[PDB]
Structure formats: structure tokens, C-alpha cells
Amino acid sequence: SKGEELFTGVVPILVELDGDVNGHKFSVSGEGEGDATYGKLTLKFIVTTGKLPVPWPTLVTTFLQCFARYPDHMKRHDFFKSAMPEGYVQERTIFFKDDGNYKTRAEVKFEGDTLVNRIELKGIDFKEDGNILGHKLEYNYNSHCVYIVADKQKNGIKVNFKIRHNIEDGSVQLADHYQQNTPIGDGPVLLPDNHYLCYQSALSKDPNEKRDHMVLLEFVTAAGITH
Ligand SMILES: [Cl-]
Structure with a gap:
């Protein structure tokens, strides 16, 4: 169908990422499902x-905002689903304080009935003994809300926010x-009034998986608009 109708049930997800951080090349594949009715990934x-x-x-954050639960009074503000099935390009620059930065470009779109997030990531200037290349971050994730703003001239949205990674x-x-x-x-897309997307995420491991991996459970809920 078109737009939010594509998200009324459980939708299989494919994530693919090609990365290069300080010359270190690697790739990652992810799979799972999203149920936007509950804002769940x-x-x-x-x-x-x-x-x-x-x-x-x-x-x-690099590895699906279309799965957010937009409350019944905020459906006209859901840009992400409105772009489906053709999708959208999500670009970011992520600056790690006192360390390097990641630049990412991803295409999020349906391929068949699967929502696919294909990403290219390039990271530079990281410190060999920093929290990133030194693997000093805790395997957990804090909750918070981000501020979504429309970018009318780009026919899209912009977001600037900070993630606090526990050390x-x-x-x-x-x-x-x-x-x-x-x-x-x-095609048409819904440009939103300013609002918030609130995230709650939990990282875990598959008990029987021997390869380096991450299991992610995330809930995303839109808020901030008056009924
Ligand atoms: Cl929340």
C-alpha cells in the first residue's frame, strides 16, 4: 500500500552496514521485525x-524511525512512514566528544514486504586508546527524547541530539x-510540526550465539503535540 498502512502489522526488517573506522573495514547484517502499533523494534x-x-x-542509532508509535492525535506528523514504500535517505554526522566522528548515509525503504535499512559508515580521527577504539563503553543504553523538526526546503526532517554512552x-x-x-x-510526505520522539532501548545477547553480535529491543513513541 502506501504510507502508514504498510506498518499496521509486524514488518520484517533487514539491516546492512558497510563500515570503515580509522581504516578498519567491516560489515554487519541485522534482521528482526518492527511492530509500529507498539513502537517496537x-x-x-x-x-x-x-x-x-x-x-x-x-x-x-545508525542501525528505523518509521517504527515509532505516533499516537492517534499525531498521525499527520509521521514523516517516516509517509515516505514509504519508496523511502528516505537518512544522513548523519556523529561527533564523539574528545574523539573521532562517524559519517553515515542510509537508505530506508521497502524491498518487497521487508523494510530495509542499508547503510554506509565512515569513521575517522578516533583515538587508539579512546573510549571507542579502546572498547571502554558499557553494553547498555540510556533512554531519552529527541527533538524532531521539519526541513521544508529539503522536504524532510532534521534532528540534532546527543547520546550519552556510559563508560x-x-x-x-x-x-x-x-x-x-x-x-x-x-511523492507526498508528511512534514511535521516540531515534536519529540522518545526512545527506550535495551541491549542483550543471544544465549547461543558464538559470533560477535548485538540483540536490540527498542521502543519509540512520538509525543509533544496537544490533542
Ligand atoms: Cl518513551
Whole structure:
């Protein structure tokens, strides 16, 4: 169908990422499903081979805002689903405080009945003994809300937010995200009034999986607009 109708049930998800951080090349494949009625995503990511060169938590935001639960009074503000099936391009620059940065470009769109998130990531200037390349981040994830704003001239949305990654020493590693989303096709899209998307995420492991991997459970709920 078109738009939100594509998300009324459980939708299989495929995620693919090709990455390069400080020359260290790697790829990751993920699969799972999203149930936007509950704003719920369940995914498992497996590195193609060997060990992932960066901490899994640092890739959570890069690895599906179309699965957010927009309340019944906010359906006209859901840009993400409105772009489906053709989809949108999501671009980000993520600056890790006192360390390197990731630049990502992803195409989120349906291929058949599967929602696919295909990503290219390039990371540069990371410190060999920093929290990222040094794998000093805790395997967990904090909750928070981000501020969504329309970008009328780009016919999309913009988002700037920070992720606080807990460090084993008790401190926190900040990752400043600058995000832009643009539709792929020339069809209509819903440009929203400013609002919030609130996330709750839990990282875990598959008990029997021997490969380097991450299981992610995420709930995303839109808020901020008056009834
Ligand atoms: Cl929430």
C-alpha cells in the first residue's frame, strides 16, 4: 500500500552496514521485525566476520524511525512512514566528544514486504586508546527524547541530539548527532510540526550465539503535540 498502512502489522526488517573506522573495514547484517502499533523494534546484528572494531552501543542509532508509535492525535506528523514504500535517505554526522566522528548515509525503504535499512559508515580521527577504539563503553543504553523538526526546503526532517554512552569508569562518552532525512521519491510526505520522539532501548545477547553480535529491543513513541 502506501504510507502508514504498510506498518499496521509486524514488518520484517533487514539491516546492512558497510563500515570503515580509522581504516578498519567491516560489515554487519541485522534482521528482526518492527511492530509500529507498539513502537517496537526487535533486532539482532551479527558482524560479518571476526570482531567489530568499535563498541556495539556506538552503532545503535545508525542501525528505523518509521517504527515509532505516533499516537492517534499525531498521525499527520509521521514523516517516516509517509515516505514509504519508496523511502528516505537518512544522513548523519556523529561527533564523539574528545574523539573521532562517524559519517553515515542510509537508505530506508521497502524491498518487497521487508523494510530495509542499508547503510554506509565512515569513521575517522578516533583515538587508539579512546573510549571507542579502546572498547571502554558499557553494553547498555540510556533512554531519552529527541527533538524532531521539519526541513521544508529539503522536504524532510532534521534532528540534532546527543547520546550519552556510559563508560566503565563511571563517566559518560557524549556522541553529538546531526541528522537529516530526505525522501527518495517525489511523492507526498508528511512534514511535521516540531515534536519529540522518545526512545527506550535495551541491549542483550543471544544465549547461543558464538559470533560477535548485538540483540536490540527498542521502543519509540512520538509525543509533544496537544490533542
Ligand atoms: Cl518513551
